[model samples]
Structure formats: structure tokens, C-alpha cells
Target chain A: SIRTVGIVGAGTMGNGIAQACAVVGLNVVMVDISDAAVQKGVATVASSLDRLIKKEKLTEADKASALARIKGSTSYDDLKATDIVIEAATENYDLKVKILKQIDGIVGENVIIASNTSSISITKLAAVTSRADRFIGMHFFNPVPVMALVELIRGLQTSDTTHAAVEALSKQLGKYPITVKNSPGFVVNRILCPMINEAFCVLGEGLASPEEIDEGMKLGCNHPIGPLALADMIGLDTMLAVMEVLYTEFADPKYRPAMLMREMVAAGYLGRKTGRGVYVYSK
Target chain B: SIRTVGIVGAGTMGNGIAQACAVVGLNVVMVDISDAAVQKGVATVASSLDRLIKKEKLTEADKASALARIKGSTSYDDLKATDIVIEAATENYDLKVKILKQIDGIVGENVIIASNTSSISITKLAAVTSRADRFIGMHFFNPVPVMALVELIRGLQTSDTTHAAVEALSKQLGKYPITVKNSPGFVVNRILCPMINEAFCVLGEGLASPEEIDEGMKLGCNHPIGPLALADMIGLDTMLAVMEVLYTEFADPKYRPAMLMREMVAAGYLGRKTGRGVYVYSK
Candidate 1:
């Protein structure tokens, strides 16, 4: 039933997501306001698939069909055929609402509209669309193809049917679905943010050096990726906003941003993207 | 220099710790006030060596040497010739003070006294010793020989010479050391306790099932072990005690034990040691 879908952004997360949907045999209408943005999103998706083929994870036929499934657009008129419309826009709440309302005018009211937000409450977001029962949260982890988690968030007004359908889609898309009630930070962020934030505190307090803190977990605790290293991959600025959101929503001291967190973000050490947070790179 | 090392107390941590010393070619004068406690400690250490041999991690020669290095004693008189004294004694400040005073009366001023306390401040414990310069924290991970990180805490009065000597000894003993300054929870526990406590918050809120919480981290996050599984391994009672100490010492909301953590400990579901925690084990 999910033949065509539309993604309303061309940022890293959006394009990565569109690539996932297209790879799974769904027609994707990846849209952005500018022609340049649309071209970049398509290019991103294509290069990603090309890398998969080079790595022998995808056959030439598989790559061809996956690429054939996508159709980029700058207009909602072309997105009407989309069975689902996912907004992977900025974390700005007002901007999300404005985009949701505009998309609602074109797409069917019953067409599933999901936000890929990490921190915002689904209930508040569901209010923007006239179809609360159809609106939900489909939080895909970053690097959609590689990361298997797809958190299905059920809003206050989201029907059980809507919930089940998304869960079904998650399985269909070969994702392991973990359903969480529409709560602040949902499930993963609630636990993950505090732990990563504490890593910042350790660095700030000079309890352990950044390298030592990371090595302690890698060697002492056998974690695949140390929290600090993960923080670097996930921009410190991105991490800061999520921590602040969780802190404000919970009003708990655990979520309070560490002094180093602010300093690192303010100094433009946004991590791997900007080439540093805990450790600097040549890039 | 560790040709003869003294290990105080005959509890689980004490015995496991003494065995680790023996396993590393140090003769351990495992001492406790009570004869029964000393016997049990010796037996625990013997059984651990048997397991090591059975797992093929220890050869017959290694096991024989380890066994040869350990001798149980019920008097501080045996500590006189020891180079280092590892005090894996009670958590009570008063009891530890009395024991430290008693040990100092027998051992020379050059003997380094190491505290294996999880929560108590190394500085406060060092205050009991006549030669504070010789006092340091050698916080070993549980099960002694298994967990690799040995947190070397620098107490207020701990000297550079003592720190250097111990750091050398840590390498000699084949332990990965992270030198952390004396603080509440030192390094690992300071950050770890707060995060584990935060998981309790998630449990209290009932946002996700305990199984889901554990699985989400295992599958979604790719952690070697889930947080709840770790909680189960580290008895909920011990986690609660350590967390309470941290919460009380730091006076931070992040460290406050969740209501669920309080109730779980009260229910005697103290994890693997007690055969249950958030999830029950089959008896």
C-alpha cells in the first residue's frame, strides 16, 4: 500500500531517509524549495547507493531499480501521489508547524505525515495537521540504512490503527521497531542524552581527559563507540539542543547542559562535521 | 616489591581482590579479624582459581603459583613485611578508621594503603592514616581479574612519589589505569551512577518496558551489554547504595535514586546476585 512517499527537506538526514525508502522499492518525491537543493539531495542518494554497489552490498540491478524509484520535486502538486509525507526539517517548532499546514493543503488528510524530530513532543506536533489520528512520529536513527532502529511514537490522539500500520511498515522496511509513548526524548534520547552529557561533565571537571574518558569506555567497558566519539559524529551543536530540550522538558539536573558543552558549541567545535568537538581532525 | 602484599578484610571484594594479586604473582597475606571470614575468603579465592584453570585461562603451573602466593591469616602481625596493603574492608567510615589505625600500628610507614571503596572519598579515608603521603585509591572493577580498569585516585595528601610508584605497579600488575582526582564517585562511578539512575527514571515513568529498554540499547545502540543487563549483574542493592551516596554527596537531582530504584531494592530484587532485578532470572 505504501507505493509512493515524499520527504520535505534536502538536509543530510532527509536525503539519507529518502534513499532508504527508495531502496526498499517505494517511489520517493524528495522535495526542497531550491532546484540546487533538490539536485544535491538526489546526488547524495545516488552516491550512497553507488558506494553500496562498490562494496558489493547492492547488485547493479538493485541500484538501478532503487534509483528509478525516486523522483525529485520542488512542488507539492507533484507530491500528491505520496502515500506518506515525512518532514525531516529543522528542529524549529514554528517552522515544522508551518510546513505541516502547507503540506496538509495538498496531500490527502488520511495520508500519513510524520516528523523525524528527536526531541519535540508528538502530541504538540500532531496539532498542526488537521489529521491528528493520521499524524505520528517516525523517528529514524541517523544514517538510515545502517542504523536499524525506527521508533514508532504514538501521540495522544493517534489511533491504535495508525500505530499498528506504522509498526507494520517498520517491519516491512526491515527495521526493528521500538514503540514508545509520546514522551519527551521518547526512549533512546531519554537514556542516551544524560550519559553523553555526563561525558561532557567529566571533561569539564577535568576528572578525565577527553581521550582517557573515551578510552576508558572502549577498553574498560567494551563499548563499540565511546559516548564522546558518538557525540562528535552527532554534532555537539545538535547534541546541545537535544540536551537542552530534554533538560527543559524534564526539569532535571541530569539534563542540565555541562559547561564544556556550551563552550564547545559556542566556539564552533560542532564535531566531525566541523572537524572537532572532543578531538580535532585535519578536515 | 610486591613479593609479599597484604589484603585486608575477607568479604567477596576483598577475596576477589586478593586472588587478583595472587594471580599476578604477588604473595597475598589475606587477613581478616575473624577466622571464619578468613577461611571463607581463602575458599572463594581458591574456587576462583579453579574456575580460571577450568576455563583454560590459567595453566596448571599458573594455578599452582597463584595458589602458592596466597596464605590466609587472622592477624595484622602478618602485614609487617608487606610492600602494599589493599584495604577491601567495610564501607563504614568509623570501622575503616579503626582498621586503618590498627594496620598502621603493625605495618611500617612506607606501606601504601589502598582503599577499594566505591563511594567514600579517598581523601577522607586517607585522613585516618599516619602517613597520608602513602595513602591512595586503587578502585578495581568487580570480580578483580576480569574487569580491566583500575581507577587510581589521587587523595588530597597523596604524594607524587606514591602516585608514580602505584602507576608503575598498576602496569606491573597488567591493569589499565586511569588516574582520577579524589571526588565523589571518582571517575567512572561519577558519570556511570547518574546514567544508571536516569534509567530508573525511565522505568518510573513507564515510557518503555524493561525488556524494550534493554533490547533497544542492545539492538538499536549496538552496546555489548544492555544497561538493564548490567544493572542485573551489578546487584540493584549495590547500585542503589552507591547512587544514594553519590546523590547525597553531590546534592544533584541527576543522582537522586528514582522511586522505582527505591522500590526495587526494597523488594529484594537485587539483580543477578539476588537472582532478579528489573527482569527475573530462572531459578
Candidate 2:
């Protein structure tokens, strides 16, 4: 039974995972490179918890206690006592490995190490660690508290014991866990990014506008939402990045990112953060 | 304002379109090469109506009247009075165009001529006809009575009057229509088929088994249904053909049909239609 979980990086995905663990009553240790970054992560978690309370999804007391269970630090030493350390740093391959390497040096021999990577090679990251048997990839979706899945990816060297523990932990946190091979973008992102790019392409190709396309799927196909709607909501940069990973890794033209996703990326408006994707969102 | 609707071929898609028209109280003229085929189309429409009745979505009187509105024909002469003649023949270009040409020779000058082609070029089909402005692609999905969308595609020569009239006709049949340019797979199939192919590819690559593959979409990606399950329902043969067309027209193998998709098709495991697909369906 694992309790103390350390999440490296305080970005959107990292903070969401920290909130996921904390709400499930697990003690969450959120780490970053600076005190300011750590405080920002903590603030983000608090604000999100406040949102849950505002929506009446969480009791005020539970919100406070969930926040109480999450502690922020700028040091790797804070993770030494943790049972599991998940690397949720930014998606650059080298950056993720460096963060994982540092965490590996401090955590216990039996402590499980995981990466929240959507496309980076999990096996290469696991091979760099001395405890290959304890290393794995636990891929969680964005807005972790609301999304209900964590893809448990198995590297070449990842032991079954490590896999079982992470799968169980995902269930403990109220997520359905699926096991996938350590491949580019795994199962979800590999299939997802391309769909999003196709949606973007149709808008540029004059087939239909954003609203018409969304309504077509919602009412016609029984899919209540469409790709562009999700793209506008989720971070487009992440969508673009994963599609590039999928294309480059597979070296297939079919995996190529659509022009609009690239144009949106070039425009410096990467989804909700910039409030512009297929549609403009006013802050 | 279109009342007499002529649907050619009397296959699944043709029958569905006929049912859709009849349900809206329009006089439906369902045509086939033989009387047996026409009777089968009428029977399928009756069975589908019974399904709606079983689900309590429609009444017995409405079903009877709707059936009464639909009349089957084995001759092009029967479509002379129809305000619209939509050719829902087989996916073969020659077969569909031939049928459209014959109907064009007899129908009134103002009659709107349409094809339910999934991959053929509407522009090319329109070019062979005397009424180029009247020829358009009114693509419908399988089980057309239940599905809510009709992809309204404009051939290069299609007129504004033709487009607007057909769009209104689609709405009258209780479908939300989206206007798209004459492209390889149009909007839905262009985005949809490749995603299903990718899902098939990942499974063959040993990325994940069917359950995990589907669960990722259902739970992780926020899709109401899994792409693989959709592949099963839509049929792999149809999915493979569209991908092949996409690849050929785009001249990019990125639309290369998935290996498993090719294999499943070769093995005669078409999909739910044959009682076997990505998952086995009861016959």
C-alpha cells in the first residue's frame, strides 16, 4: 500500500497529478527547481481545489485536508522518503531523463519510479536507472482530477512487480489503468493527436467551419464532442508536440501534423493558454 | 419543400435514405435493378421502423403511414416525377455515374441529382452529366435512418440553388448537414478512417490488446466510444477502401491501410455485418 507520492515538476500536468493523489488521501510531495515554482504549483492545486468546492463536488473540510496532504519543495531530498516518484517534467527527452536520474539517486531501493511521458522512449529512460525493475511509465491524461485513466506503459526492462504496483495505484486514485507498450505516444496520444490534426485540416480545407463540424459529430455520430472542441480546450502545443513525436518516431507521412496545428503552433497561441486554436477564447 | 424523393440501388444506404425520407412524410421512391431487391429494401426499412417502435422512439401509426409513403420501383421511369433523385448505389464510380446519367435523362430539369459516394469525386461525376449544377454528393453513413448527419459535398460546378435546396432537404429528413468541398474522404471519413487505421496499427504492433486499446479511448481520451469498436461497427472493408482511396488521391501512403485491417479483410472477418470484427458479434 503506497501513500507518499512525489511528483517532479509543477506544471499543469504535474500539478494535476499532485491534486489527483492528494484528493485520494495520498500524501503528495510536489517538487520543482525553485521555491517560486514550487509555490506556484501549490497555488494552482489550491485554486483547483477551491473550484471543486465552488462546484460543490468537494466538502470544504475535504478540500482543506486534501490541500493539507500536499506539500511543495524545491529539493530532491524531500522525495527521499517517498514510496513513488513520478517524473512529469516538460516533454523534452533529455530534460525528463535528467530529472528522473536525480530522483533515482535519492529514492529508496524498493521505491517505484515512473514517467508521465506521452511520447518519449520509456525504455531508454528506464535503462539509465540502476533499478530498472522498479522503473515504468504511468501516463495520466490532462485535468487529472476529472479524467479517469492512467496508461501504464512497460519499458523493456520494467518488471511485472513495478507494473502491478502502478496499475493498482492508478485504481486507488480512481482511474482506470490500461497497460501499453513503450511506443511513440502510446495508445491514446498516438490515435488522438492525428485525429485532432485532421479536424484542424478540415477547417482549413473549407469543408466546414468549427461550429458546423462539432455539431455534425455531436448530433449525427453520437459522439457528443468533436476533435476541434477538445483541441480548443486541451493544450494545442502538447497536441502538436505529440503528433510530431508520432510522425518522427514512425517516420510516416500519415503521422504528419496538419498545417493548422503547425500554424497555430507558429502563431504562439498554443491552445487554451493563448486562448486561440480553431476558435478564439476570450480570457 | 421537396416531396417525392427517388433513391436508387435499394442497398443498405439507399434503403436508409428512403426510410429517412418516408419518416418525414415525403413520398419515397426506392428503386433497384429487380423487384426482389426493391422488396428487400422495403423489408429492411420496415424492420428498422420496428426497431424504433421497440425502443418506443416512434408510434405504430407513424410506422404504418411511413411505410405507406414508400413505394419500390425497378424502372428509372418511376423517378420522373421525383423532385430529387439521390443515387445511393454501390461505391463503384462507373455504376453510380451510370445510374445518375439514366435518371438525369428522365427527371425534370429542376430535379436535384445526388450520389451517396464515400470516396468518388463528386466533381468528376458531375462533369459526365448534362445537369452539372444539379449533381452533388449527399454522403450518408450506414443505418442512415438512425445516424443524424448527411455530408453535403459541392462539386466544382454545383450551383448555390442546388446546394441550398439539398441542404434544406437534409434538414427536412431530420439530419444536420455539413457542407464540405469535394475532397478524398470528405470531412468525417477523412478524419475518421485514418484514426481507426491507426488504432488497428497500434494493436498489431503489440502496443496494446483490444481491451486496453479501446479503454484508452473510452476513459483516457474522453471519447464516448472506442475507435476499434467503431471500426467493428462500421466494418473493416469499408474502412480499408476509404483509406486506399485517401492514399491514392492524396498520393501519400500515410493513409496506407493498417496491416491488421488488410489481414482481417482478407480473412473474411468484415465486421459486425459478418458477425465478426475487432470483436466477435453474435450473428
Candidate 3:
């Protein structure tokens, strides 16, 4: 039954979400703090649609239509009439809470709110809002228009009605939705980041070269990519931060980040961005 | 120049190794303790080649020619003239050492000896033989003719000549070789099992249902299979065994087997083999 979608923060995730929603014939109000930010988000969505057209996945008319459904603005007032307002802002705790409170006060009492957080607690975020039963976490993977997964996280107080509605909405956005109780790293990251951290430990112990480790997993387990190579692509700093979050939330030594990763981050060899990590990259 | 290959204990791995060697036009001597076991091994290879023929990957003449080059025997003397002897026996420490000593005494002085052991220590096995310098580990995956990776492990006393010769021999059999120092689980299982173990912890914590966790990983990480489902396919008994080996070797709490996995194993819900594991299977 959800129709008009309001998105706060017109960044990578925000724009991708807007494009996906707009493509599905939903009205999108994309709000940012500044005119430049809002403009860039719309531009990014337009370029993405053009790429889909180039690949024959979308027609020029389809791109035009999708873009037409998305309205970019620099004010929260534009989101007042939206059926659901999704906060896709930066992954900072205080910033997310402040934005949720502001949006809670503006939207109608029956309106549902969701956050696109990868790690933070949906329960904690919902506690800041008056509509805790309606607030949920709709975690979309990067490049949201392409990746088909949306982890629908239910907070401690998230209602059954809210879960079912968001689950249906996710499918409408062309995503495969999996419901999970709010916990550290939820399911995907809880299982993935630790494996990446262990790869760092293996590298540090000189058990095998990074190439050998990567090749072993690639051939042995039929994994698409090796853990170390994946770590490089995911940015060592980001990997460490997620590990820190898991370690802090779990308070278990098993979640401790690899020392080598910490040292690499300290040296600013943050991965592909810095051109050096577990392996070197060329500019 | 490993022109003639001698394989001890004609089991699953032994026959697959023989098929791969014979397909590449090398003489193979496959020995087992009894005539029936050796015959069963050869029959398995024949049916496998028939499958390949059905798939249009092999011709009738090719299957006949490969089978012709493979000689099944029940005598240790059959390995005396071979250039290399590979022990593909059951994964028992004492049994492997006994076989290695017997083969070392039978084969020529310059002949290399390798163990196709997935878990046991190559160094310890080499210690039982007279020619420790010529001893190495050539770990092959299941259905060796299909999987391309060969983990060439070097024990402490394994020489450069032995390592190089095995590497070349691996390529001649149409496999990609990766060299690693002798260690627990080498590269693949060392990194793999812990991740599987963590998935069990996630399940035990009631974070998500089994299907949700599996689907989340498949859609999120692009893994060919989810960890819990993979654990079931890999038999919870075997999974527990490997985790125990890792835990025992490293003495690290992180490698400790999940209590749920141990309990499942104890309850005899081993996996697809038992028709029930983390999920149910129909006969």
C-alpha cells in the first residue's frame, strides 16, 4: 500500500534507493542538507539509468520516466506527505538519531520509518522515534539498484504488521528480503567479516602467501573471490571498523580485529583507496 | 619426470588420481589391500569416464585408452619400478606412517614419495621414510579430474627438488599447484571451517532462522552455498573433526567448535547423509 517514498541524505545509498523506488513507479522525495548534494544525487541516478539503457536493460523512455518520478529537494518539509521516510544518511550514531527525531516529528502518525544501516542497532534507532512499532531497518547492499538483497531487520519492538509491510515493499523494489532479529552484524556481516579477519591472521602467520590463500579458497570452496583480495576491495579501514563493532558488541576475543589490519590502517595503507594493503594496486 | 605413478590404497582419491594420471598418458599402478577393493576402485573410474562420455567431454576410445594404462594390483612389489609413489590411504596417522615405510622400502632410491592426505602432517609422515628429502604432500580435491587445484605441501625436511618435481607433475596431470608450508588445514579448511562454525553460533543465538541466514549469505556475499547448508553437506561429524583439529593445533578459543554443532553431531543428525542436519532432507 506504500506509495510516496521520502529519502534523507542524497548520498550513494540514498540515490541508489531513490532510483530503485522510482523505477518501480513510486514517487520519491530525496532530501539533502544542500542544493549541491541534492543535485548530485539526481545526476547520479540519471547516469545510472543511462548505463542501464546502454546495456539494453532499460529504454530511454524508461530512464526518463524513472527520473521524472524522483524529486530532489533541500528541505525536510518535502517529506511530510510521504507514506514512508527512509533515512540513508552517514553511518554515525548521533547523526542518525537526530535525523530520525526530526523526521518523526514531521511525518504523519501512521507513517512508517526505516533506516538503511549496515551495522547499528535498529532497536536503538527506533527507541528515539515515537513510532517504535513502525520503525524498522531495511539494509540494502551497495549499488542498491543491482544487488537483489534487502536485510529486513526487526527491532525489539518492531510489530508483525510493520515487518510484513516492509517485506512486501522490499519485493516491490526488486529485492530479496530476509527477516532477521536485530543483532551485531545481523547475519551476512556477522558471518563474513570474521572470515576476512581470519585471512589477515593467516597472512600475518606466514602460513601462505596472499595469492595462495586467495587461490585456495577460489578453487577449493568455489568462492567468487578470496578473503584477502575481498578485504582489499572492501577497504581495510571499513573492515576494521565492522570488526571493532562486532568485538565491542560481543565482547568476545574471537571478534578481535587482526593486528595486521590495525597496523595497515595505522600506516594509512587502507587498501585499494591507498594503493597498498594485503597486496599492492596500481593507479 | 614422473613417467610412472604408484598409488597405494585404491579408494576414492586413489582412483581419481589414477584416472587423472592415465588421461594425461602416464602409467598408473593402483594397489589396495584386497582384490575386491582394487576392482571397485577401477569400476568407479570406468563409470566416471562413462559420465564424461555422456557429457560429450570424452570419447569411447579415450576412456578405453585411459583404462588400459591403469593397472590394478594387490601387491607392494608393483610399485618398485615406479618413479613416484603416492599414498592415498584412509586418513589415519598410524596407517599412513605404516604405508609410507612400506612404500619407501619398495620404491627406488631416487623415486619421490607423496601423500595425498587432506589433514595429516606431511612432515611427520616423511619422518617415517628413509628419503625424507624426497617426500612431499600433494593434496588433491575430490573428483580430481574435475577440480583444478593441487595443494603441494612442503614438510620441514622436504627438498626443493621434490617440491619442484611434484609441482611439474601436478601440472602434467592438468591441475593448478599452490605450494604451502605444512600446517593445519593448510589454506582452505583453515579459513573455511571457522566461518562455518560462526554460522552455527549465529543460529544458536537465535538471530535468524536457517533459511534466512542461508539466503542472506547467498544474496549478500555471492557464495555458491550458505555456510550452514554447506556444513550439512560436509557432514557435521567431519565438520566437528576439522574444527577440533584446528582448535587442538592452535589452542585458540576462536577455533573452538560451536556447541550446537557438537550437540547436533551427538544427536546423530549428521546432514544430507542422515536426512537431517541444520535443515531436513527427503529420501
In candidate 3, stretches whose alpha carbon ends up further than 4 angstroms from where it belongs are none
Candidate 1 is graded, for docking, as medium
The better candidate by DockQ, 2 or 3, is 3
TM-score for each candidate, following the candidate numbering: 0.92, 0.90, 0.97
The residue pairs that clash in candidate 3, if any, are none
> What is each predicted model's overall lDDT from 0 to 1?
0.82, 0.85, 0.90
The i-RMS of candidate 2 is 1.6
lDDT of 3 at B170: 89
Q: For this target, which candidate reaches the highest lDDT against the unseen true structure?
A: 3
Interface RMSD of each: 1.6, 1.6, 1.0
Q: List the candidate 2 regions with Cα displacement exceeding 4 Å.
A: A33-75, A92-95, B50-65
lDDT of 1 at A138: 76
Candidate 3 per-residue lDDT over residues A214-272, each given as its tens digit = 99999999999999999999999999999999999989888999999999999998889
Better model by lDDT: candidate 1 vs candidate 3: 3
Candidate 3 TM-score to native: 0.97
Single out the weakest 10-residue window by summed lDDT for candidate 3 chain B. B89-98
Give candidate 1's total backbone clashes. Answer: 0
* Model 1, span B127-243: residue lDDT tens: 889999999987887667777768889898999999988888877677788888888877777776666777777878887777777767777667788777888888888888888
lDDT, candidate 1, A58-131, per-residue tens: 68998889888889888877769888888886778889889888888789867888888888889998987888
By DockQ rank, best first, the candidates go 3, 2, 1
